[PDB]
Design a protein around this ligand. Sequence first.
Ligand SMILES: Cc1cc2nc3c(=O)[nH]c(=O)nc-3n(C[C@H](O)[C@H](O)[C@H](O)COP(=O)(O)OP(=O)(O)OC[C@H]3O[C@@H](n4cnc5c(N)ncnc54)[C@H](O)[C@@H]3O)c2cc1C
Ligand SMILES: Cc1cc2nc3c(=O)[nH]c(=O)nc-3n(C[C@H](O)[C@H](O)[C@H](O)COP(=O)(O)OP(=O)(O)OC[C@H]3O[C@@H](n4cnc5c(N)ncnc54)[C@H](O)[C@@H]3O)c2cc1C
Ligand SMILES: Cc1cc2nc3c(=O)[nH]c(=O)nc-3n(C[C@H](O)[C@H](O)C(O)COP(=O)(O)O)c2cc1C
Ligand SMILES: Nc1ncnc2c1ncn2[C@@H]1O[C@H](COP(=O)(O)OP(=O)(O)OP(=O)(O)O)[C@@H](O)[C@H]1O
Ligand SMILES: [Cl-]
Ligand SMILES: [Cl-]
Ligand SMILES: [Fe+3]
Lengths: 484, 374, 374
Amino acid sequence: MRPLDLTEKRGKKVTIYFEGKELEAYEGEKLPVALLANEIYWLTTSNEGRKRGAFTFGPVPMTVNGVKGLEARRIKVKDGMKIERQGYYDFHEEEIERVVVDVAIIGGGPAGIGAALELQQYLTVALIEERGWLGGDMWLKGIKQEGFNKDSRKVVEELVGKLNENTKIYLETSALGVFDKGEYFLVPVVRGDKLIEILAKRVVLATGAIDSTMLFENNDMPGVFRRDFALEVMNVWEVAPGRKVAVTGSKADEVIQELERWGIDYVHIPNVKRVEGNEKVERVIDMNNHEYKVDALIFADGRRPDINPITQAGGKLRFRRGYYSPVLDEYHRIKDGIYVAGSAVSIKPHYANYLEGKLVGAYILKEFGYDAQPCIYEEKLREYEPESLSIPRIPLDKFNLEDVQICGCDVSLKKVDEVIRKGITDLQIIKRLTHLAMGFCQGRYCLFNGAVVVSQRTGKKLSEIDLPVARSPIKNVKMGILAR
Amino acid sequence: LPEKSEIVVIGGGIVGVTIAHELAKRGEEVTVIEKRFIGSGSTFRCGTGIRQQFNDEANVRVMKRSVELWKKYSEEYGFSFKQTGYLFLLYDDEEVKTFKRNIEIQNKFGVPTKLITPEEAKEIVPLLDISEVIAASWNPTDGKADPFEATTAFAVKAKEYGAKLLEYTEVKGFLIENNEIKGVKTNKGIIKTGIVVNATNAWANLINAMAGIKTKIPIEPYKHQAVITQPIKRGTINPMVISFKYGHAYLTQTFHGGIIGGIGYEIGPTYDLTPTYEFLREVSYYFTKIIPALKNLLILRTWAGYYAKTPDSNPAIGRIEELNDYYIAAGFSGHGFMMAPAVGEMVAELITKGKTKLPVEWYDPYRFERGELR
Amino acid sequence: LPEKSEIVVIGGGIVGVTIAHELAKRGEEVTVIEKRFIGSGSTFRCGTGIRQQFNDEANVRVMKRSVELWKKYSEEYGFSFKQTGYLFLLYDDEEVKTFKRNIEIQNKFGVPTKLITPEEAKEIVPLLDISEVIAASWNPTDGKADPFEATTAFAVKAKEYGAKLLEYTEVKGFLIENNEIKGVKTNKGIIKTGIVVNATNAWANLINAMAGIKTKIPIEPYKHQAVITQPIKRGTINPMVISFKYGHAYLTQTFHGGIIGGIGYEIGPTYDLTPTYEFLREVSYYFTKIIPALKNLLILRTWAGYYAKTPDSNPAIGRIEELNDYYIAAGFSGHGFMMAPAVGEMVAELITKGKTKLPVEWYDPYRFERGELR
Ligand SMILES: Cc1cc2nc3c(=O)[nH]c(=O)nc-3n(C[C@H](O)[C@H](O)[C@H](O)COP(=O)(O)OP(=O)(O)OC[C@H]3O[C@@H](n4cnc5c(N)ncnc54)[C@H](O)[C@@H]3O)c2cc1C
Ligand SMILES: Cc1cc2nc3c(=O)[nH]c(=O)nc-3n(C[C@H](O)[C@H](O)[C@H](O)COP(=O)(O)OP(=O)(O)OC[C@H]3O[C@@H](n4cnc5c(N)ncnc54)[C@H](O)[C@@H]3O)c2cc1C
Ligand SMILES: Cc1cc2nc3c(=O)[nH]c(=O)nc-3n(C[C@H](O)[C@H](O)C(O)COP(=O)(O)O)c2cc1C
Ligand SMILES: Nc1ncnc2c1ncn2[C@@H]1O[C@H](COP(=O)(O)OP(=O)(O)OP(=O)(O)O)[C@@H](O)[C@H]1O
Ligand SMILES: [Cl-]
Ligand SMILES: [Cl-]
Ligand SMILES: [Fe+3]
């Protein structure tokens, strides 16, 4: 057992080296998780000298066997592996498959599975998921779940269990976007390092929501965990974020329930001002200047639909219930032939998103001439009012602005605030002046916040501040993979 | 919103503001009218300029001059223009002969371009794959600059010198009395003026239409595209590297560290932006042929913008005689950012003296109907 | 819906049905699978064929043969194929020399084309403006036919001879065991077969994709367009008149009396139909240059259709070896209607004997990866 193991691992034991030090890991574990288990948090430094971990926004470039600039999260641990830290900008110096399919479902959470289950009654589908497992956010929980009155992870197993050979599953697979060729849609997809082109008649974006990022002082430092990452390490791998854990944000109960299940000690800090520490977090300070000693901070401030795949697919947005949503016709369509389902549509219980996927799959099944009954899913859905999110009042005056990070790359809240103060309110321009939303997330974890700041400094309402649209490759792909 | 103005420049991109800028520092009173923000449009989607390696006297003289103005204003207003060179990679005797010939004409007019060696080309840009390059055209006084940074700079100076820059203000029509311009009709009232300049390149036709110009000045918007990679160590790729053989690829590194670039891949006369999968594939193929290390680099985003094309890839810059005090500076066909400082100077002189130091007549608005393509 | 079939032809356009037709009259059992109706698709949007004036031996021999089959089947099934000729108008020595050379090769292989005089060209087609035509290429055994009429005819005979023609039936996949085809998966069940023919020209890639064919066979759909005028006295314009100089214009009169035609104006790889204003303007300009009387004629409608283009404007017709009993006959690049009777014959013989009388190897599916363009 390593110090942060929640279980004794029974996988094949393996040995790796971090900065020369000999560490034990298990086969199949991903680099940052093996290092966490061994109490190692600080994995890289940004170009302007900011220490960083793997469990919040931003990329983790690491030298993995003399090969510079590999992404830590993507790398499985391997016996004899030589791992080292490096600069942010340090790079290394040194057979297309075509598959035709009826629908192409992007995203493998409850919505995606839902759609696939409905669809494979008669059609051939691609279920595309970049994640390596086929649950959704649901596979991150293991707490009993409403709707299917049954344990979160047990439901996923049941559902995956029910998939046909009519469903081609694509794990560890990144969709690069959707391209309408009139007669079909092209969804180019990357798995391992092969490019696969999926030509489909229909598409469904079952694309999910992403966790909102909280603005407080060293919010990027090692040992801060965004909700999803904390749940992943605890529930998927079985590793604690730390020995004693601070928890914050408006959905902190979801996290606390997991902590309690695993018996991980914690404090609940409703309003975080700052985190401090040399390599990692060791104190958090609240808005009343109270300090708490802890090894990690976990924040959970609500999920918001990931709008990138929507807007690259050519969909339009609406602001409602504290977040941006897809504008849909009466059939959950973004545009003719592209359906949207799940937490991509709105925030609501897993079961609801599951139904919406079935709903969306049923419409296309009806399109195809099969006798489906989308409305039974429709009427089940209405039983679930979509959730709201409070819009954050960022106490700008009360923060030391250069310490609070807005995006992954450079980009402090101060830089953004500065340009707004000089009159610029158009996010298009803000994007260019500061590098907000130009980093390796494409604004996923910062655009909305940038908007909130403009809105706050301006008085201009959020339902009027329109968002820069997502462009060509919605996910990072390198570049060799795309020739010839 | 002013209600009278001696001169009205339509369009507030690099060209529009750069023209205003010259007129204003020359003591003249100018207001620019931009329908969105200063520097939106192609200038906002633009690569990083700036080149003197052209193939005819006029363009070479204009760009020589232009580069002098880039040096001057760059340091004088503090906006940053690195002279890292332009590097044309050559692969066969066909190309070598042609460039030997281009360089010759460049030299005559004071642009000291050299034909160089593969290993020399690889000293500059160490990551260049040199295996099938047989020579390269090199000029160390070509460079790159951020079109947005540079436009905003010229903009605040133009205002300082007394120009009015009107932002969410669209031109919709003209008050034309006899053949006199009397006013420019907008979405926010009419402005009285006798002299107007059309600097809306991709939109030039629209402005020409509103003015009732009957002279054929064919300027079509075409969709060109660009890619940006993840940031990389500073000074990894310094000059603009061009490869005609590999799909009219151009690539260089941004000041942020990016490595930006595009290829020839043109999409027929359209106002559509929105990038395409086919461009994504092609740029990846071409770039990685030219510098192989790019294979290990993440692509972050892709975008599109207009080339405002004419049949001979040269702008239309001149006085239109049949409308009284109508000028055009539009249709820069992909290289209008680099020209801007110089065309500013030219247009100012036209307005102001009736003739120009530089050979502005190469860009004659009337050449097309007359059948005289360059 | 059958459940087994010796041969399955995918696509029920002129090419698809014409192939089935040969196989069936040869005693073989064929079922065609068409996703809409027999002859929808390009055949439905097609001009009126049919020409032997090509510039290389294979095409000239194939079309000579093809025309023999048009004569035979035309009268034998009663579907009407008027041999009114094709008339290529020439305007300069450049063109004359080139056509002198084309005709020469045409003649060698039994296509008796003549180079003719302006006044001769004007006897045929009295309304031709002859003022700048210096010669014309004329062959009196080229003609025109209605692609829909002709397809439906071949269709009902193919059925008579025992072919199954399946109409609202789309191919979606293939059951491939080893490298054996076992079945063609459709929207209405699977059909067992060991031999399949891909005749879906514009869609060819899709079918190739479903089959897992890894050989590069580049076939792109391009938007071409046509116009129809109001009906006019019978026999006013009898031959197909071609003018390369005036925008690759082709025009002729329909059996209804229409005067149908298009021009070169191609719109980049797309599946979009829907006509354009720019085509409307251009066709009007070109036609009225070639025959001035057209100026007084009402345009009624305009439409669009696919050319299924390859890099060398020749189809891919052959056996694909790595899939067991996969054939392709697709990519006719604008002249696939006229070829159909002959390609039917060729494909039948391939399936049936393993080789063909005609030079089918010119249309080698493998030529493109091998780098060998025609
Ligand atoms: C991908 C790409 C890369 C490029 N790279 C380079 C390069 O490396 N070097 C180079 O020199 N050039 C480059 N260019 C081209 C360069 O962007 C253009 O030549 C240049 O921006 C032209 O500037 P402009 O001011 O004439 O046009 P614009 O910047 O488009 O300015 C015209 C302005 O007029 C405004 N307007 C239009 N209609 C109206 C109206 N009715 N009323 C008021 N305003 C109106 C528009 O809002 C617009 O802002 C590139 C272009 C693209 C697309
Ligand atoms: C404006 C215009 C004018 C033309 N003029 C001439 C001319 O004068 N002379 C000449 O020779 N040619 C001409 N052509 C070209 C001619 O139309 C084509 O070469 C010819 O129609 C090709 O026939 P085809 O049967 O190969 O293609 P098509 O007629 O398109 O047949 C392919 C069929 O396959 C079907 N299909 C596609 N996918 C599937 C699937 N998955 N399952 C089942 N079926 C499927 C389609 O429904 C379609 O009906 C012209 C074309 C255009 C657009
Ligand atoms: C000089 C220049 C640098 C750019 N750098 C980046 C970048 O580093 N990251 C990024 O995501 N986009 C970058 N872009 C693309 C911008 O997002 C660009 O303005 C754009 O995408 C146009 O807006 P649209 O894509 O919403 O149409 C750059 C564009 C230019 C012209
Ligand atoms: N471009 C993409 N390629 C592949 N997978 C993607 C892509 N974008 C998003 N995804 C995946 O889509 C899935 C979204 O599922 P998620 O569980 O978040 O939402 P859901 O299925 O609507 O239901 P719930 O939100 O209640 O779990 C995630 O697993 C995410 O990794
Ligand atoms: Cl341009
Ligand atoms: Cl065709
Ligand atoms: Fe980012």
